[PDB]
Symmetry: C3
Subunit: 171 residues, 3 copies
């Protein structure tokens, strides 16, 4: 179908898309420094950084986030099939869960001991924060991830409006 | 094992079932306008409807749908025949008589591939919380033009409620059979 | 790599670990009375019991179950030998001592939960059926004494696995 409502919808989308793009004529993905490389898979983003004997990965999804929860994976080259995984949330940025997981695991193994920080020693919590900082994951990184996630969100929103326009226009 | 406790349990169920069947046996089962067909599988219900160039499907599960009355979240899937590869998916729900009040609201919208393994997490999903009001209104109109309006949402509550009762009765029957054996 | 922060983290962990062991080592893994057989799968524990004509299993995971006391939600499955394909499943938790949150039949041995099966939520349920269900559990070994011993067992497990985790963490941070 292609009702009158659908046609008014399309005109509305044409206008909104025009305005959104106007607000995006002088804007590009806020690059982050520190050796990080960005990889995108739909709404899932991954930041990868290599250091002496280690590989650090930060994953986040922009859906319903823009301050997206992010997962930090630290892999020491000694044992490349194992990694320390820290689930972080947004008082600026905090570690919510910590556990060891198998690298490139097809899924998540909920049978691996998972430390919840809700009931955790303050000293242990702080060392974990220090551990992440030594590897480039600190407040600055977190502030910059928010800016990036927000920018990715607005561009995917625009893409979405266009997909919606084509859809409502079809048939 | 068949204990004294099990016999008392079976005694309770036999008469609960009968009482249940008697009561709910008056609603004559709610009928819905629009020409929708109910395709049920256990607790998962699908209301299907077709119009020029499109297939409209509304899916909801009666489990954990009670906040007596069933008000389940429901997913609307609109498929344009010229591209049955994907569909526009709208996750709706009933807000926990203002002129500006709707029986239901849209919480999320996204494009998904038809008959996909499961909700693709890497697909853009638009949350309606801080959504532009005119865009939201258009989404509601889009749904309405396909039969998913406040009357529909009202009838859905009637249907889901009747389904809840009917499956509750069947549950007691399976339970009675379970406890009665051995 | 191995930084100064890492070094201080490892030393901290060594002390942390000695303290936990010093506090723990004084009691053995508490036993469950009633003939239950314990099986471990990482943080997942399964207690199995066989009674006349049926098998009863109780499963729980020490993760997110909280000296720190562990009171995990546990799932009871009752399998009749007269129909081993279906199982009555009761999800329980600690708010008497424990309560039933939901009940439903599931396929025995299934690899994933089947959301198309009618699931009864006790929140919206008469108290008559609820009591019969609690009695059904009691007749099969899942009574108040069970739940109390389950807490001790889960607490002893969570503590031992917490220690093992710290040892793992220490070794990992010591690496490179």
């Amino acid at each position: 179908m292609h009702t009158d409502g659908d046609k008014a919808f399309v005109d509305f989308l044409s206008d909104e898309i025009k305005e959104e793009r106007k607000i995006q004529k002088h804007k590009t993905l806020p690059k982050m420094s520190g050796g990080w490389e960005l990889e995108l898979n739909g709404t899932e983003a991954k930041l990868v950084r290599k250091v002496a004997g280690e590989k650090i990965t930060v994953t986040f999804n922009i859906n319903n986030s823009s301050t997206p929860n992010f997962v930090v994976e630290v892999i020491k080259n000694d044992d490349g099939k194992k990694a320390l995984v820290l689930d972080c949330h947004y008082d600026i940025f905090s570690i919510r869960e910590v556990s060891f997981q198998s690298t490139g695991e097809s899924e998540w193994k909920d049978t691996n001991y998972t430390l919840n920080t809700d009931s955790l020693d303050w000293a242990l919590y702080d060392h974990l924060m220090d551990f992440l900082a030594d590897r480039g994951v600190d407040n600055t990184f977190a502030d910059e991830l928010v800016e990036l996630s927000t920018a990715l969100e607005h561009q995917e929103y625009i893409t979405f409006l266009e997909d919606l326009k084509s859809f409502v226009k079809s048939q």
